[PDB]
A = this chain, B = another copy of it.
């Protein structure tokens, strides 16, 4: 508001400073008008007799010099204080979580960007987490809703009380849309890690590997049973080949 009013005033001033200048009135003497010719606007023909100096452009006050400076000061004050830049970049959730995510190019050291991120973080901490905790308490303190568990391919009625309290739950907001894909990468990376060490191989059985692959697919390939992939329920051990049998014999 403090920026607005002032600016408007100046702008109004500016407008009239032009509007009046648009009239372009011509000052003239009394006895040297030559009204018939002067009124006519046809190209050329004015009879400017009687000293040849009977008409002159009416002087107009020049635009005040400070108007441009005041406008620039107001604009920069708005940019630095409000936090909005004409050609500045926005804040993605990824940079919001960590401003150094794009440290290679987009260090995001801009004061306006930092102020905007600060106010966004204040909104998130004050409002979002409180709302989520309130909803969690409301659902946890009443209602009977089941959950579709995959192991039996059915619905299990989990009592609301069975859910843990807020003391043991951390709430996170402002998650990037592509974060899921990122998680997938981690999983495969983790897979490689657990593939590197053979000590953990006995624990990492077929079911765990299939579950990890299914999680990766759900991250990208929502549907998995559509093709060669076979659910572990219908899987059966392969029949031994004659070659190994005869080798054992």
Interface residues of chain A, those whose CB is within 8 Å of chain B, are: 6, 10-11, 13-31, 33, 41-71, 73, 76, 79-80, 84-90, 92, 94, 97-100, 102-103, 105-111, 114, 176-178, 183, 186-188, 190-191, 193-197, 199, 204-206, 209, 213, 216-217, 220-221
Q: Which 5 A-B pairs have the closest CB atoms?
A: A89-B109, A27-B48, A30-B49, A24-B61, A21-B64
Q: Given A61-B57, A195-B197, is A49 in contact with B31 using a C-beta cutoff of 8 Å?
A: yes
A53 lies within 8 A of B55 (CB) = no
Among B42, B68, B103, B205, contact of A23 (Cβ-Cβ < 8 Å): B42
Q: Which residues of B contact A193 (CB under 8 A)?
A: 188, 191, 213, 216
9 contacts across the A-B interface (CB closer than 8 A): A23-B44, A27-B48, A28-B46, A97-B177, A98-B178, A183-B220, A190-B221, A193-B216, A197-B209
Cβ of B53 and Cβ of A53 under 8 Å apart?
no
- The answer to whether A18 touches B64, judged by C-beta atoms less than 8 angstroms apart, is yes
* Contact B43 A28, beta carbon cutoff 8 Å: no
A190 engages B206 (CB within 8 Å):
no
Q: A221 touching B187 by the CB < 8 A rule?
A: yes
Which chain B positions have C-beta within 8 A of A97? 177-178
Most buried by B among A47, A109, A111, A176: A109
Closest residue to A103 on the B side, CB-wise? B102
Further contacts, 18 of them, CB under 8 A, given A17-B24, A20-B24: A13-B19, A17-B22, A17-B64, A21-B64, A26-B45, A27-B46, A29-B51, A52-B56, A55-B59, A57-B60, A63-B65, A84-B111, A89-B107, A89-B109, A98-B177, A103-B106, A183-B220, A199-B204
**Min CB gap A20→B, angstroms:** 7
Q: Which residues of B contact A18 (CB under 8 A)?
A: 10, 13, 64, 66-67, 70
User: Interface centre among A43, A61, A191, by most B CB within 10 Å?
Assistant: A61
Q: Copies of this chain, how many?
A: 4
**Option from B71, B90, B111 in Cβ contact (under 8 Å) with A114:** B90
